[PDB]
Design a protein around this motif. Structure first.
Motif, mmCIF file in Angstrom:
data_model
loop_
_atom_site.group_PDB
_atom_site.id
_atom_site.type_symbol
_atom_site.label_atom_id
_atom_site.label_comp_id
_atom_site.label_asym_id
_atom_site.label_seq_id
_atom_site.Cartn_x
_atom_site.Cartn_y
_atom_site.Cartn_z
ATOM 1 N N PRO A 1 0.855 -0.986 -0.035
ATOM 2 C CA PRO A 1 -0.226 -0.027 0.107
ATOM 3 C C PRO A 1 0.858 1.286 0.130
ATOM 4 C CG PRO A 1 -0.962 -1.542 1.504
ATOM 5 C CD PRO A 1 0.358 -2.136 1.171
ATOM 6 N N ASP A 2 1.749 1.197 0.909
ATOM 7 C CA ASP A 2 2.671 2.443 1.081
ATOM 8 C C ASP A 2 3.399 2.860 -0.148
ATOM 9 O OD1 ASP A 2 1.945 2.811 3.711
ATOM 10 O OD2 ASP A 2 3.223 1.118 4.133
ATOM 11 N N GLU A 3 3.849 1.921 -1.086
ATOM 12 C CA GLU A 3 4.650 1.991 -2.267
ATOM 13 C C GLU A 3 3.807 2.760 -3.190
ATOM 14 O OE1 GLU A 3 7.810 2.140 -2.678
ATOM 15 O OE2 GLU A 3 7.433 3.122 -4.859
ATOM 16 N N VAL A 4 2.389 2.222 -3.314
ATOM 17 C CA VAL A 4 1.326 2.407 -4.296
ATOM 18 C C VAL A 4 0.861 3.910 -3.899
ATOM 19 C CG1 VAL A 4 -0.931 2.183 -5.561
ATOM 20 C CG2 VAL A 4 0.654 0.403 -4.492
ATOM 21 N N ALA A 5 0.751 4.462 -2.684
ATOM 22 C CA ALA A 5 0.588 5.712 -2.229
ATOM 23 C C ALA A 5 1.772 6.782 -2.659
ATOM 24 C CB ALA A 5 0.338 5.742 -0.716
ATOM 25 N N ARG A 6 2.898 6.220 -2.422
ATOM 26 C CA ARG A 6 4.100 7.248 -2.713
ATOM 27 C C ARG A 6 3.877 7.590 -4.157
ATOM 28 N NH1 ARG A 6 7.067 4.704 1.528
ATOM 29 N NH2 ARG A 6 7.101 2.423 0.407
ATOM 30 N N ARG A 7 3.651 6.657 -5.312
ATOM 31 C CA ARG A 7 3.969 6.943 -6.580
ATOM 32 C C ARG A 7 2.436 7.621 -6.867
ATOM 33 N NH1 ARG A 7 7.144 2.546 -9.914
ATOM 34 N NH2 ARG A 7 8.672 1.648 -8.345
ATOM 35 N N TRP A 8 1.405 7.427 -6.247
ATOM 36 C CA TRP A 8 0.071 8.095 -6.611
ATOM 37 C C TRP A 8 0.588 9.826 -6.245
ATOM 38 C CZ3 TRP A 8 -3.390 9.252 -9.345
ATOM 39 C CH2 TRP A 8 -4.510 10.032 -8.660
ATOM 40 N N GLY A 9 1.280 9.787 -4.904
ATOM 41 C CA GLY A 9 1.438 11.318 -4.471
ATOM 42 C C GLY A 9 2.388 11.759 -5.518
ATOM 43 N N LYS A 10 3.363 10.990 -5.916
ATOM 44 C CA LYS A 10 4.392 11.615 -6.734
ATOM 45 C C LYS A 10 3.867 12.109 -8.101
ATOM 46 C CE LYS A 10 9.077 10.479 -8.131
ATOM 47 N NZ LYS A 10 8.750 10.972 -9.478
ATOM 48 N N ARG A 11 2.892 11.350 -8.644
ATOM 49 C CA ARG A 11 2.096 11.509 -10.114
ATOM 50 C C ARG A 11 1.276 12.686 -9.969
ATOM 51 N NH1 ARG A 11 0.356 10.964 -14.616
ATOM 52 N NH2 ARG A 11 0.104 8.780 -15.613
ATOM 53 N N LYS A 12 0.828 12.933 -8.710
ATOM 54 C CA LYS A 12 -0.212 14.032 -8.278
ATOM 55 C C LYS A 12 0.460 15.288 -7.476
ATOM 56 C CE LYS A 12 -4.520 14.150 -9.076
ATOM 57 N NZ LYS A 12 -5.149 14.185 -7.788
ATOM 58 N N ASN A 13 1.935 15.269 -7.368
ATOM 59 C CA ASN A 13 2.526 16.149 -6.642
ATOM 60 C C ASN A 13 2.104 16.546 -5.289
ATOM 61 O OD1 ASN A 13 3.795 18.705 -6.114
ATOM 62 N ND2 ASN A 13 4.068 19.038 -8.495
ATOM 63 N N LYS A 14 1.461 15.099 -4.786
ATOM 64 C CA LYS A 14 1.134 15.387 -3.129
ATOM 65 C C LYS A 14 1.690 14.736 -2.428
ATOM 66 C CE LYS A 14 -2.534 18.143 -4.512
ATOM 67 N NZ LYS A 14 -2.319 19.419 -4.109
ATOM 68 N N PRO A 15 2.929 15.046 -1.860
ATOM 69 C CA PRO A 15 3.952 14.320 -1.238
ATOM 70 C C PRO A 15 3.367 13.926 0.105
ATOM 71 C CG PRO A 15 4.365 16.832 -0.946
ATOM 72 C CD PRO A 15 3.492 16.521 -2.020
ATOM 73 N N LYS A 16 2.656 14.548 0.756
ATOM 74 C CA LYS A 16 1.809 14.190 2.018
ATOM 75 C C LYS A 16 0.885 12.783 1.892
ATOM 76 C CE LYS A 16 2.899 18.650 2.180
ATOM 77 N NZ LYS A 16 2.565 18.847 0.808
ATOM 78 N N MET A 17 0.657 12.529 0.664
ATOM 79 C CA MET A 17 -0.273 11.617 0.463
ATOM 80 C C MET A 17 0.266 10.156 0.787
ATOM 81 S SD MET A 17 -2.757 10.219 -1.147
ATOM 82 C CE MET A 17 -3.375 11.337 -2.171
ATOM 83 N N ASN A 18 -0.811 9.402 1.372
ATOM 84 C CA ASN A 18 -0.333 7.959 2.180
ATOM 85 C C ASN A 18 -1.483 6.938 1.843
ATOM 86 O OD1 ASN A 18 -2.037 9.226 4.018
ATOM 87 N ND2 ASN A 18 -1.330 7.528 5.412
ATOM 88 N N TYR A 19 -1.334 5.876 1.974
ATOM 89 C CA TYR A 19 -2.332 4.783 1.585
ATOM 90 C C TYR A 19 -3.820 5.304 2.402
ATOM 91 C CZ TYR A 19 -5.267 0.487 1.609
ATOM 92 O OH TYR A 19 -6.189 -0.225 1.523
ATOM 93 N N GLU A 20 -3.562 6.042 3.543
ATOM 94 C CA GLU A 20 -4.738 6.383 4.348
ATOM 95 C C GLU A 20 -5.726 7.185 3.162
ATOM 96 O OE1 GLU A 20 -5.930 6.554 7.963
ATOM 97 O OE2 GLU A 20 -5.309 4.506 7.228
#
Lengths: 130, 118, 118
Positions: free
Chosen positions: C50-69
């Motif tokens: 989950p954490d790896e997917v969230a990280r990339r999602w955040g990165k592709r969305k420029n939302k660094p705070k993004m986490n699986y939650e």
DNA sequence: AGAGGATGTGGCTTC
DNA sequence: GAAGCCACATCCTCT
């Protein structure tokens, strides 16, 4: 003050009523977030109970209808033109005793309808106010 | 008690925002007050619509009359009124016969609602 | 990148890419198989990390705070829109319920084989 | 773990 | 440019 003194004029003048006198397009507003199948069974069954939610599409003015005087074969009619329903119900709209008359296609769930002053009930009510 | 006149000479209603976010609780609980005399227990229902939406979707648009007052617990507007356009409220006091008081251009509902310019 | 996932899903560069289209883009990239993959059951996938997917999602969305939650709340918003559902009982396992076969043009078996999903 | 309510945020389109 | 429409991003309460 359940009604306005100039009951007769208030209806023959004010735009609100004039635009609702003509044979305006009406439609069933009930459960618009459910399968058409359901909206049909709900609309009809409810009519047999003497009530329904109809709104004048054009002006968008909604109205909750109570098909009774004061089961009722006279008002809620289901004979004339099989498949249709010629409902009818009185009410005091903005201090103006009136009656609602229209029809709806038991399938399309819409049709035409209109309003009209209520000489008698208006009179009675105008008396209670004295 | 900030009341306002309605389209009926026998009813009054609380003040509603001129613009508000859909499905959002209102800033002040909506109320319907009867000038004349209405028997306690009488149901009161609200409805909305206009040229762009013949019948707006509402939430908790039902209330019971008590001491001439019908308190709508968390009335919400889900249907939208359209850009610039407003809704026409249709209050209905279920007596015999039923009384109905309208309120044109009552409130405007949109996706975001009130929001500072970017 | 076996096939143009996000592309066939409707994404056209116009505006931000949607979460479901992003996840699809990852599920079609043989390299992103270590943290996200198909379960082999229809269009059902599971985020093994989950954490790896969230990280990339955040990165592709420029939302660094993004986490699986935060990401899972995006998925849950798909439940009503009928795009992705949750597999009750299986941790981090979701399923596309839209018509992926029409969008992608391939059937589950075919895409699995192509992606060599074991 | 997971469902879903409340409310703000930035991209984009229409008036 | 304002004013709408979307899809989230954030935060949280409850089970």
């Amino acid at each position: 003050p359940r009604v306005v003194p100039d009951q007769r004029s208030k209806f023959e003048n004010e735009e609100f009523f004039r635009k609702l006198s003509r044979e305006c397009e009406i439609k069933y507003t009930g459960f618009r977030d459910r399968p058409h199948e359901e909206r049909q069974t709900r609309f009809q069954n409810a009519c047999r109970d003497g009530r329904s939610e109809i709104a004048f599409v054009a002006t968008g003015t909604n109205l909750s209808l109570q098909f009774f005087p004061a089961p009722s074969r006279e008002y809620v009619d289901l004979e004339r033109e099989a498949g249709k329903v010629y409902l009818k119900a009185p009410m005091i709209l903005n201090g103006v005793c009136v009656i609602w008359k229209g029809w709806i296609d038991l399938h399309r769930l819409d049709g035409m309808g209109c309003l009209e002053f209520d000489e008698e009930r208006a009179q009675q009510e105008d008396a209670l106010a004295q | 008690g900030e009341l306002v006149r309605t389209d009926s000479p026998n009813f009054l209603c609380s003040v509603l925002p001129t613009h508000w976010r859909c499905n959002k609780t209102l800033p002040i609980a909506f109320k319907v007050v009867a000038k004349g005399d209405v028997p306690d227990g009488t149901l009161v229902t609200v409805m909305a619509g206009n040229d762009e939406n013949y019948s707006a979707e509402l939430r908790n648009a039902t209330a019971a009359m008590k001491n001439q007052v019908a308190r709508f617990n968390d009335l919400r507007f889900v249907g939208r009124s359209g850009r610039g356009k407003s809704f026409t409220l249709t209050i209905t006091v279920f007596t015999n016969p039923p009384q109905v008081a309208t309120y044109h251009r009552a409130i405007k509902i949109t996706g975001d609602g009130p929001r500072e310019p970017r | 990148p076996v096939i143009p996932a996000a592309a066939l899903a409707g994404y056209t560069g116009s505006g931000p890419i949607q979460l479901w289209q992003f996840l699809l883009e990852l599920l079609t990239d043989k390299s992103c198989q270590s943290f996200i993959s198909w379960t082999g059951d229809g269009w059902e996938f599971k985020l093994s990390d989950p954490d790896e997917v969230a990280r990339r999602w955040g990165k592709r969305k420029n939302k660094p705070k993004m986490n699986y939650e935060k990401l899972s709340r995006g998925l849950r918003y798909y439940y009503d829109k009928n795009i992705i559902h949750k597999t009750a009982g299986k941790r981090y396992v979701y399923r596309f319920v839209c018509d992926l076969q029409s969008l992608l043009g391939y059937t589950p078996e075919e895409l699995h084989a192509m992606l060599d999903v074991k």
